[PDB]
Scaffold this active site. Structure first.
Site, PDB file in Angstrom:
ATOM      1  N   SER A  27      -2.410   1.052   6.178  1.00  0.00           N
ATOM      2  CA  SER A  27      -1.675   0.712   4.947  1.00  0.00           C
ATOM      3  C   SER A  27      -2.020  -0.672   4.560  1.00  0.00           C
ATOM      4  O   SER A  27      -2.111  -1.614   5.265  1.00  0.00           O
ATOM      5  CB  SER A  27      -0.168   0.874   5.160  1.00  0.00           C
ATOM      6  OG  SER A  27       0.164   2.219   5.456  1.00  0.00           O
ATOM      7  N   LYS A  47      -8.067   8.566   4.681  1.00  0.00           N
ATOM      8  CA  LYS A  47      -8.008   7.133   5.018  1.00  0.00           C
ATOM      9  C   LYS A  47      -7.967   7.038   6.467  1.00  0.00           C
ATOM     10  O   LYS A  47      -7.516   6.042   7.050  1.00  0.00           O
ATOM     11  CB  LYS A  47      -6.793   6.477   4.359  1.00  0.00           C
ATOM     12  CG  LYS A  47      -6.829   6.487   2.840  1.00  0.00           C
ATOM     13  CD  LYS A  47      -5.698   5.657   2.255  1.00  0.00           C
ATOM     14  CE  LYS A  47      -4.367   6.380   2.368  1.00  0.00           C
ATOM     15  NZ  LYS A  47      -3.285   5.671   1.631  1.00  0.00           N
ATOM     16  N   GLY A  73       0.781  -1.195   0.000  1.00  0.00           N
ATOM     17  CA  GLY A  73       0.000   0.000   0.000  1.00  0.00           C
ATOM     18  C   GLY A  73       0.838   1.283   0.000  1.00  0.00           C
ATOM     19  O   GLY A  73       2.014   1.396  -0.466  1.00  0.00           O
ATOM     20  N   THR A  74       0.231   2.291   0.560  1.00  0.00           N
ATOM     21  CA  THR A  74       0.681   3.662   0.784  1.00  0.00           C
ATOM     22  C   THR A  74       1.442   3.689   2.159  1.00  0.00           C
ATOM     23  O   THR A  74       1.402   2.670   2.870  1.00  0.00           O
ATOM     24  CB  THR A  74      -0.499   4.651   0.776  1.00  0.00           C
ATOM     25  OG1 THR A  74      -1.374   4.367   1.875  1.00  0.00           O
ATOM     26  CG2 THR A  74      -1.289   4.529  -0.518  1.00  0.00           C
ATOM     27  N   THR A  75       2.106   4.819   2.482  1.00  0.00           N
ATOM     28  CA  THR A  75       2.661   5.099   3.805  1.00  0.00           C
ATOM     29  C   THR A  75       1.541   5.722   4.639  1.00  0.00           C
ATOM     30  O   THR A  75       0.799   6.565   4.132  1.00  0.00           O
ATOM     31  CB  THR A  75       3.886   6.029   3.717  1.00  0.00           C
ATOM     32  OG1 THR A  75       4.918   5.394   2.952  1.00  0.00           O
ATOM     33  CG2 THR A  75       4.427   6.329   5.107  1.00  0.00           C
TER      34      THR A  75
END
Lengths: 233, 243, 243, 204, 245, 245, 242, 108, 250
Positions: F75, F62, F30-32
């Protein structure tokens, strides 16, 4: 192998998610091209209706969920119905219990949860259908994208179905202009038809394939169906 | 059916693959434990390490206080350890209402063993990997150590060890107990009991460990307490006060 | 056995694809909806002196305004009829009026989804999907005469004429040329007989064909053996005088 | 209507020495009106005799119930139920649904096949135990019967004389009722012979 | 789930068989023997206990003889365990008929139920069936003496001499010859014992390798009194026929 | 080896099921997102990816709230994270009614823990593939916790997960050392923003939109609130000052 | 849960489990029904090879479903009890509720319906039995003959034959019956039925069991004595056509 | 032995168009199969080729071969070269039983 | 979601066997030498005590459990299977008999109740079948002293002496020869130590034998020192010193 992780819906694979789930995302593209667009006061949905024959009559690609709401499908039909009933049920209860219409956002998050549950259940399946759900609540005009694995995104504009990327290029240019026209229905509507014919490249457009639905600040869920889409091309 | 390790059913040999693998690699998680019995206490020393400076080591727990008086030392991983803790805690509490009495080590051990066995026969659950050492100073038996292990087997100890320095710990205590003709040492104060433990620990694992690398849990009559970080250094310095 | 939730790289389920295979093996059912009626015709087929050939028919009445002709497995079409009668009867009691043919197809298609292991969305109680496809023909006072093709997959389309069965590839092709928007009930029935004769490897008798019609002064009406044969008698002579 | 005295009934059991006797009326009524002079309330499972007085219906349900329990026990252990054993079984079954209606007074009589001692017991509607080894009585005229039995009874009676006590006791208790009329049977019981003797008594 | 963690052996086969059933009969053919001879004044029953010892009790002579009633009993060939569930439930099925109509169950009704429960374990559930075959030794006043066998498949057939277990083949070949169509008990006993020796390898036929029961009319015992012979009465009959060799 | 890649209902010899390994992997994919504990509170910040101008700000945050004082960010994959939270919420509503008090951050760790662990005892339920960083202020102090997808969780002083996990721990570990724990809650927004900047350097194929929220007992009063307006705007500037590029 | 699959599609648009159900019937014994225009005759095999069967408690092939209706079968007895029981209950259910004697068509729909269910529904398999159902409708003198398969399909037939060597018995029957002139007298229709079923039983005249059904509950099973007589006669007929 | 163990995509229509069955020898054929096998023989005159065929229930050509081969043995053991009818009959009874064994699912 | 496992995990193989029962039996053969003897003046059962550790109690350890008061059981097989099974056997024995017929179940009747547990477990899926074999040695006052074997499937058979575990057959030979009925309980204890010395070599003691008898009474086993009303237990487990005393008694 493919066949090793495919048989039931309960397994993850090194990819990070199951093969079957990607095949559900793939089906949406098979089914009908539908574009979604909004300004900030109204939001417009444009959908191409397809049939199978000359002597076949169209299958509806807009299903009205409320007198202020409706959605378009793209992909597998039987699941799109099982979902539209659930959304009907969710809507009504909100009105019965809370006197509440049902926000697009609010609906998206309930729909997501239902989708996780049917992707942890082994006999269960991904739905295999994506939906563009539109509404005007007291949150303003809205477009949401629903995907059948529980991915829910709020957008200005988007497309699912045949060459989604196709429509997306059009919308991203004409974006800044149409969205600041706030209080004129007709323009945003006219941009919708202008877009959808350029995504096409192995199909053509016509009057009774096209069907337009608008919801907004002064437009309660209304469909222009058949003949009456001519005056937006 | 299926197979003998895709679902839990007998092996070709009458063995169970899942229980033997549950014995092995659940004590190699950088954990080694011993428990020894006091005169009027029970001492546990257990390793407990934090690999970041950014991980608050207070929340890091592997000696749990099951009740106000009961302790349970888990050897094995935190996903498993909390399934067993929830069961232990519930059992402890239930016992207290229904039978009107505080929960003995032995009863808790026995109950948890039989339950694990049922989950061992199931074809849609696993036996937990954890090895559970239940400690207090009962008023119905004195200081007690009872250990369950993962197969549905459980048995009482007077002193126990786990992790592959089992042999070292055992031999030092055995020789000692054969000479003194007792399996419990005599000393009142908890402090002297922890010093006895350390002596056998240091020799046997061949090293000494920091405050935050140890965790020491002491059972007393109607209390179980864990020693603060300074309190665990005080003891390590106190033997070295002698030196 | 075979997955119940396992899709093709396109994303079309195995079970759906297999549903399409049984359909293609029945005897043709052909409907033409006109402006005075719906005609449904079937090839019943088989003629033997050890067979009662005029006691079996493939055109069954659901209601006093709704029939269905089928093609594919016939045993399967019995469960579909039992569900469909119950749903139509309960709606006539609540609002006193005719149920919509599209509405019926959706209610039935909902229970076509169960097969296999259960879901948490749905309780899947069956083992396979239905291996018959149907042409459901009716009348309603709010869309007049109509003709519908229900696939067991979930999709149901409204048509002005459609053929299903084994011999559908030819049949449909003929339907289009013969179809126009001033077609009437009496012409349509004669034409049905033309199509049926052409594709037969036999002489057309009423112990291998059955006609049916819809008029709104009588509901769904079976064109009886005696009338169907009189129509066959008229065909054979007129055709055999164009040669 | 009455709850158990439509037909009525009374039951007496006594011990001799290594023998017993069990006696009962044979009334069947519809209220105080007598209809029939025959209704047999004594059944036996081996050397266990069981008489139950009260409502006809209720007596039946227990009899078929003990019949089901005795049959599967007999078949499985290869041994017929003894009186001592049978008394625990009557108790337990009553306890199982005492909050179901019961309008019964079962009385057991028999001589043991494992200790040889004459054995009698009484039972109540809720299933209180009567341990007794002289006489036990139950039924509508039970107040009367206990008075009659306590005075008339003479112990350690051998069959001919045991007969005389139980019959005369019974005949004279019965005459202060008409809900104990319509004929009577005495069963005088040994392991070796069981004698059944009809009495002659009033009718209304 | 359970689809790829299980299999389906309760399905049909490309002959029309069911895997586990066909196999179940095999399990029975190496289990201990049960024999049924129906006479017309009695029922003679014989069973071989294959292997006996002085470390086993031979004293328990209900090991394959169970009374399900005082009018019906079965002789068992297959496992004790498999047997136990159908016996206990059959005895229960009895009591129900007895309670309802105040009369004992005919043999035929009770067989048809049993068979339906056994069919049931392969018909739904995915379960396994029993692996024991029963010989019904039974009564009616509609049919006289009755002799049945029923199988884990649930098919049941009427007999007046039958065997299941091992050595079935040898016993039945001698028996069909030496049969008399209407015969007394004592004659049956002679015929049975004669058959029995020559189906038991070498010198082995003993009283304490046999279980014997006979069901006679009597005239110091009641009509249809089942006598399940305990060791000593086996010893007697062997000496009378002289067949102990 | 095998059976442990499809199931969780049996135990690996490695002590770590191959399916569990795959669950962790989707978290790093995912993202940080990160989480900072401070001397009075917690501040949460996340990198929100910008792909196209067809997405709308602050409706695809999020950060999702549970109760009143717990902010929860993750994440991995979106559907897993929302379902996990919706369950947290339901337990939270139940909690509040029954005990008349808000749900703890330690309690909530347990609630989540037991839902994940349940799906790792069963092959018939598929577990979650997100790591969720959460925390707040309660009656018993300030807490930062991180839940990992095994059903391992602990309280931390600082946390990161995702693509940018490493770069984030580096930049955080320097700032926490310098401070006693992370100084003031005000300061912590500026610090946070620097951490996100360093974490962006592992993306560079998408632009980002900075989103921070906080829960503070000295500058919010125990509620979870977003950090927007002036405070966010000074934070973008601080990051771009010290971190150049 | 055992409501999951146990019957699956073929790629050919059959069902594997229904194809395998029909095989068990073929290996099996033979049952036949031949129609007059006064009766319906049902022949059923009882080919006792062994002589150690006692045959008054050896199961029959003839069931009452109703007093004017019979069911005969070829297939596993075990499965057939389960179907036979559900069909008796259904005759009594109609009788109770409609106050009316039972009509043959509805019963056939019922017999078809349980078998049809068990192919469609999960964690059950279809029965191992094909049946013939025949009888007479109330106040009706014309014969009724139905065939049902464990597929769950159903049909009427003027005559039909099932089980082992179905081909042979159809083929024969086809030459000896016309719908325009079917037999009027019991004796000659029975003669034909015994003759077909002789040719597949091999030796049989006590091994063949005839039951002749005339209108409304006149149902009579002819005996060995009678059958031996028709077989003699057939041995006289076969040297009058030589 | 059976063709249900061969794939239809290995048979390959259009080269292999015939898939030819095996039907049992019927009565006329049994007479014939026998007739050939009795030629090679030295036997007794009480043998009736006809009689033995008629009681045989539709039996394989294998059975017929087997029977001759079996009957010669019963003569050879008895120290003789003549083969009486009773011998053929015993061989027939034995093979006919084994083929016609299939109980409770053939013979229901 | 949740289980769906209802398909039997015990199934037939081409030979007529049951895979799970075959497997389970291998475990039993490899399990601890246990025997049972009826002395006719009692019943003596002996089993191997073992220790896990010298620093481990073996008081907790369960190798001989009292199923009902006059009855003991011992086993060879799988220890965890044994422990749960003892529990279901104790429960039903107490609820369904001890105030219904007013006493313990008869031995044969209790062997059938165990038999049923094991058979339920063999028939039904979701769970594999028990992997155990028991020797149930008993006294009931309506059958005397008894010895049974309980197999893994739940097949049972009567015995008057036997041994199961490792090294059975030879253990039975020594027992067959030394005892042939009408024998003091004490004497059967002596014979039993002798059979097991020959059976187990490497180190042998009475501190590695755990011995129970059913074949005594004390007032303490009526459970009261007053005026009798019933007979009470006859189960008595010996302590290690008493066993060493019988090892010293030739």
């Amino acid at each position: 192998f493919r066949n090793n992780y495919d048989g039931d819906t309960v397994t993850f694979s090194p990819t990070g998610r199951l093969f079957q789930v990607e095949y559900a995302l793939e089906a949406i593209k098979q089914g009908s091209v539908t574009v979604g667009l909004r300004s900030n006061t109204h939001a417009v949905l444009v959908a191409l209706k397809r049939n199978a024959d000359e002597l076949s009559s169209y299958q509806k690609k807009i299903i009205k969920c409320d007198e202020h709401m409706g959605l378009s499908l793209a992909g597998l039909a039987p699941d799109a119905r099982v979902l539209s009933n659930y959304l009907r049920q969710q809507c009504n209860y909100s009105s019965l219990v809370f006197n509440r219409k049902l926000a697009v956002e609010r609906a998206g998050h309930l729909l997501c949860d239902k989708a996780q549950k049917n992707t942890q259940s082994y006999g269960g399946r991904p739905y295999g259908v994506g939906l563009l759900i539109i509404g005007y609540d007291k949150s303003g005009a809205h477009l949401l994208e629903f995907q059948p694995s529980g991915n829910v995104t709020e957008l200005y504009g988007t497309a699912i179905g045949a060459r989604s990327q196709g429509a997306k290029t059009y919308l991203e240019r004409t974006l800044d202009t149409f969205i600041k026209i706030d209080g004129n229905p007709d323009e945003l509507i006219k941009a919708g038809v202008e877009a959808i014919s350029q995504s096409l490249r192995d199909e053509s457009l016509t009057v009774d394939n096209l069907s337009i639905a608008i919801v907004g600040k002064d437009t309660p869920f209304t469909i222009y169906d058949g003949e009456a889409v001519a005056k937006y091309i | 059916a299926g197979y003998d390790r895709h679902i839990t059913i007998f092996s070709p040999e009458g063995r169970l693959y899942q229980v033997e693998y549950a014995f092995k690699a659940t004590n190699q998680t950088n954990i080694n434990s011993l428990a020894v019995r006091g005169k009027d206490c029970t001492v546990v020393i257990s390793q407990k390490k934090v690999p970041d400076k950014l991980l608050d080591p207070t929340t890091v727990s592997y000696i749990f206080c099951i009740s106000r008086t009961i302790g349970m030392v888990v050897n094995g991983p935190i996903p498993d350890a909390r399934n067993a803790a929830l069961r232990a805690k519930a059992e402890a509490a239930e016992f207290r209402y229904k039978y009107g009495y505080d929960m003995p080590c032995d009863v808790l051990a026995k109950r948890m063993a039989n339950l694990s066995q049922i989950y061992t026969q199931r074809a849609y659950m696993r036996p937990l990997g954890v090895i559970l050492t239940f400690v207090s100073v009962d008023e119905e038996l004195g200081p007690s150590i009872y250990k369950t292990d993962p197969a549905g087997y459980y048995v009482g100890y007077k002193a126990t060890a786990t992790g592959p320095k089992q042999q070292e710990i055992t031999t030092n205590l055995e020789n000692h107990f054969k000479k003194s003709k007792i399996d419990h040492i005599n000393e009142e104060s908890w402090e002297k009991v922890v010093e006895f433990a350390i002596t056998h620990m240091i020799d046997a694992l061949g090293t000494e460990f920091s405050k935050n690398d140890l965790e020491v849990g002491v059972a007393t009559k109607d209390k179980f307490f864990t020693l603060s970080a300074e309190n665990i250094e005080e003891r390590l310095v106190a033997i070295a006060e002698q030196d | 056995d075979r997955g119940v939730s396992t899709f093709s790289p396109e994303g079309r389920l195995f079970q759906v694809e297999y549903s399409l295979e049984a359909i293609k093996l029945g005897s043709t059912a052909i409907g033409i909806a006109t402006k005075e009626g719906v005609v449904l015709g079937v090839e019943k087929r088989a003629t033997s002196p050890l067979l009662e050939s005029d006691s079996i028919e493939k055109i069954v009445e659901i209601d006093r305004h709704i029939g269905c002709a089928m093609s594919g497995l016939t045993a399967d079409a019995r469960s579909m009829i039992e569900h469909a009668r119950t749903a139509a009867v309960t709606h006539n009691l609540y609002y006193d009026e005719d149920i919509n043919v599209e509405s019926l197809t959706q209610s039935v298609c909902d229970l076509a989804l169960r097969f296999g292991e259960g879901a948490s969305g749905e309780e899947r109680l069956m083992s396979r999907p239905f291996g018959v496809a149907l042409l459901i023909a009716g009348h309603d006072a709010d869309d007049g005469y109509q003709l519908f093709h229900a696939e067991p997959s979930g999709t149901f389309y409204r048509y002005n004429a459609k053929a299903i069965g084994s011999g559908s590839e030819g049949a449909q092709a003929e339907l289009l040329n013969e179809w126009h928007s001033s077609l009437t009930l009496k012409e349509a029935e004669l034409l049905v007989l033309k199509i049926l004769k052409q594709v037969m490897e036999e002489k057309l008798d009423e112990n291998n064909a059955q006609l049916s019609c819809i008029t709104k002064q009588d509901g769904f009406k079976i064109y009886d053996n005696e009338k169907t044969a009189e129509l066959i008698k008229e065909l054979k002579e007129k055709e055999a005088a164009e040669s | 209507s009455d709850p158990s005295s439509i037909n009525g009934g009374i039951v007496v059991a006594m011990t001799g020495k290594d023998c017993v006797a069990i006696a009962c009326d044979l009334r069947l009524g519809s209220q105080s009106l007598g209809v029939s002079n025959k209704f047999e309330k004594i059944f036996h499972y081996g050397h266990v005799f069981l008489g139950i007085t009260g409502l006809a219906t209720d007596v039946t349900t227990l009899n078929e119930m003990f019949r089901y329990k005795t049959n599967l026990y007999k078949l499985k252990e290869e041994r017929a139920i003894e009186p001592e054993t049978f008394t625990q079984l009557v108790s337990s079954s009553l306890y199982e649904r005492r909050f179901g209606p019961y309008f019964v007074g079962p009385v057991v009589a028999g001589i043991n096949s494992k200790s040889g001692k004459p054995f009698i017991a009484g039972f109540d509607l809720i299933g209180c135990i009567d341990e007794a080894k002289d006489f036990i009585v139950s039924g509508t005229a039970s107040d009367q019967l206990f008075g009659m039995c306590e005075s008339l009874y003479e112990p350690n009676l051998e069959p001919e004389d045991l007969f005389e006590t139980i019959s005369q006791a019974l005949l004279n208790a019965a005459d202060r009722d008409a809900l104990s009329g319509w004929g009577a049977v005495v069963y005088i019981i040994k392991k070796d012979e069981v004698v059944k003797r009809y009495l002659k008594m009033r009718q209304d | 789930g359970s689809r790829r963690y299980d299999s389906r052996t309760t399905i049909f086969s490309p002959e029309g068989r069911l895997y586990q059933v066909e196999y179940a009969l095999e399990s029975i053919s190496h289990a201990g023997t049960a024999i049924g001879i129906m006479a017309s004044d009695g029922i003679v029953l014989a069973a071989e206990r294959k292997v006996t010892s002085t470390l086993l009790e031979q004293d328990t002579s209900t090991e394959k003889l169970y009374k399900l009633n005082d009018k019906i009993a079965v002789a068992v060939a297959g496992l004790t365990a498999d047997a136990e569930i159908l016996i206990n439930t059959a005895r229960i099925h009895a009591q129900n008929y007895l309670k309802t109509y105040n009369e004992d169950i005919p043999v035929e009704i009770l067989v048809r139920r049993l068979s339906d429960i056994k069919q049931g374990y392969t018909q739904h559930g995915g379960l396994r069936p029993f692996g024991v075959s029963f010989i019904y030794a039974g009564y009616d006043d509609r049919y006289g003496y009755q002799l049945y066998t029923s199988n884990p498949s649930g098919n049941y057939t009427g007999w007046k001499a039958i065997s299941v277990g091992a050595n079935t083949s040898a016993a039945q070949t001698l028996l069909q010859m030496d049969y008399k169509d209407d015969m007394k008990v004592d004659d049956a006993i002679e015929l049975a014992l004669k058959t029995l020796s020559k189906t038991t390898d070498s010198s082995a036929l003993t009283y304490d390798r046999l279980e014997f029961a006979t069901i006679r009319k009597g005239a110091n015992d009641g009509e249809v009194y089942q006598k399940i012979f305990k060791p000593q009465e086996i010893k007697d009959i062997l000496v009378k026929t002289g067949i102990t060799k | 080896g095998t059976g442990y890649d499809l199931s969780n209902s049996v135990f690996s010899p490695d002590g770590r099921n191959f399916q569990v390994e795959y669950a962790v992997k989707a978290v790093e994919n995912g993202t940080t997102s990160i989480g900072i504990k401070c001397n009075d509170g917690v501040v949460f910040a996340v990198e929100k990816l910008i792909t196209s101008k067809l997405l709308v700000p602050q409706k695809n945050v999020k950060i999702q709230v549970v109760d009143r004082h717990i902010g929860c960010v993750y994440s991995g994959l979106i559907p897993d994270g929302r379902h996990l939270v919706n369950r947290g919420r339901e337990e939270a509503a139940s909690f509040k009614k029954l005990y008349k008090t808000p749900i703890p951050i330690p309690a909530f760790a347990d609630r989540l823990g037991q839902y994940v662990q349940a799906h790792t005892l069963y092959n018939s339920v598929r577990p979650f593939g997100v790591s969720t960083i959460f925390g707040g202020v309660d009656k018993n102090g300030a807490h930062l916790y991180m839940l990992e997808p095994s059903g391992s969780y602990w309280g931390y002083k600082g946390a990161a997960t995702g693509k940018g996990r490493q770069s984030a721990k580096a930049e955080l570990e320097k700032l926490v050392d310098h401070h006693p724990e992370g100084l003031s809650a005000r300061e912590a927004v500026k610090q946070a923003a620097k951490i996100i900047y360093l974490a962006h350097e592992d993306n560079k194929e998408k632009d980002f939109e900075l989103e921070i929220s906080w829960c503070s007992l000295s500058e919010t009063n125990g509620l979870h609130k977003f950090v927007k307006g002036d405070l966010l705007q000074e934070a973008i500037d601080f990051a771009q000052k010290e971190i150049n590029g | 849960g055992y409501d999951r699959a146990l019957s699956i599609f073929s790629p050919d648009g059959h069902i594997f489990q229904v194809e395998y159900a029909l095989e068990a019937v073929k290996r099996g014994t033979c049952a036949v029904g031949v129609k007059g225009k006064n009766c319906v005759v049902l022949g059923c095999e009882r080919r006792s090879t062994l002589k150690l069967q006692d045959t008054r408690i050896t199961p029959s092939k003839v069931s009452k479903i109703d007093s004017h209706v019979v069911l005969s079968f070829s297939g596993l007895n075990a499965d057939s009890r389960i179907l036979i029981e559900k069909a008796r209950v259904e005759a009594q259910s109609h009788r109770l509720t409609l106050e009316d004697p039972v009509t043959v068509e509805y019963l056939t729909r019922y017999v078809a319906g349980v078998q049809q269910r068990y192919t469609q529904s999960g964690g059950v398999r279809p029965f191992g039995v094909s049946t013939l159902i025949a009888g007479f409708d109330p106040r009706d003198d014309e014969p009724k003959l139905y065939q049902t398969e464990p597929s769950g399909i159903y049909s009427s037939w003027s005559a039909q034959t099932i089980g082992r060597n179905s081909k042979t018995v159809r083929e024969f029957l086809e030459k000896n019956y016309d719908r325009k002139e079917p037999p009027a007298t019991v004796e000659e229709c029975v003669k034909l039925t015994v003759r077909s079923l002789l040719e597949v039983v091999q030796t049989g005249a006590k091994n063949i069991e005839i039951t002749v059904v005339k209108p409304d509950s006149d149902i009579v099973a002819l005996s060995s004595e009678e059958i031996n007589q028709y077989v003699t006669q057939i041995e006289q007929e076969k040297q009058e056509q030589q | 032995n059976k063709i249900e163990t061969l794939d239809p995509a290995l048979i390959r229509p259009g080269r292999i168009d015939r898939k030819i069955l095996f039907e049992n020898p019927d009565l006329s054929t049994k007479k014939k199969i026998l007739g050939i096998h009795t030629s090679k023989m030295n036997l007794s005159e009480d043998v009736n080729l006809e009689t033995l065929v008629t009681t045989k229930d539709d039996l394989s050509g294998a059975d017929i071969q087997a029977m001759c081969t079996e009957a010669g043995l019963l003569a050879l053991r008895e120290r003789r070269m003549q083969v009486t009818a009773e011998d053929f009959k015993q061989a027939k009874e034995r093979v006919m039983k084994n083929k016609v064994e299939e109980n409770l699912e053939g013979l229901y | 979601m949740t289980d769906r496992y209802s398909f039997s995990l015990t199934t037939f193989s081409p030979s007529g066997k049951l895979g799970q029962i075959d497997y389970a039996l291998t475990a039993v053969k490899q399990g601890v030498t246990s025997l049972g003897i009826k002395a006719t003046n009692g019943v003596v059962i002996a089993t191997e005590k073992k220790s896990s550790s010298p620093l481990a109690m073996s008081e907790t350890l369960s190798k001989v459990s009292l199923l009902t008061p006059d009855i003991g059981a011992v086993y060879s097989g799988m220890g965890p299977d044994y422990r749960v099974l003892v529990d279901k056997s104790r429960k039903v024995a107490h609820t369904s008999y001890k105030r219904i017929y007013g006493e313990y179940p008869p031995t044969k009747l209790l062997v059938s109740e165990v038999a049923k547990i094991m058979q339920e477990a063999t028939q039904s899926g979701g769970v594999r079948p028990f992997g155990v074999s028991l020797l149930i040695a008993g006294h009931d006052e309506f059958n005397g002293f008894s010895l049974y074997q309980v197999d893994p499937s739940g097949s049972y058979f009567p015995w008057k002496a036997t041994a199961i575990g490792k090294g059975s057959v030879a253990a039975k030979t020594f027992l067959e020869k030394r005892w042939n009925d009408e024998l003091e309980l004490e004497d059967a204890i002596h014979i039993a130590l002798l059979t097991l010395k020959e059976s187990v070599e490497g180190e042998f003691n009475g501190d590695t034998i755990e011995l129970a008898i059913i074949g005594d009474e004390n007032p303490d086993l009526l459970g009261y020192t007053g005026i009798p009303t019933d007979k009470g237990p006859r189960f008595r487990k010996l302590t290690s010193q008493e066993i060493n005393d019988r090892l010293e008694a030739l």
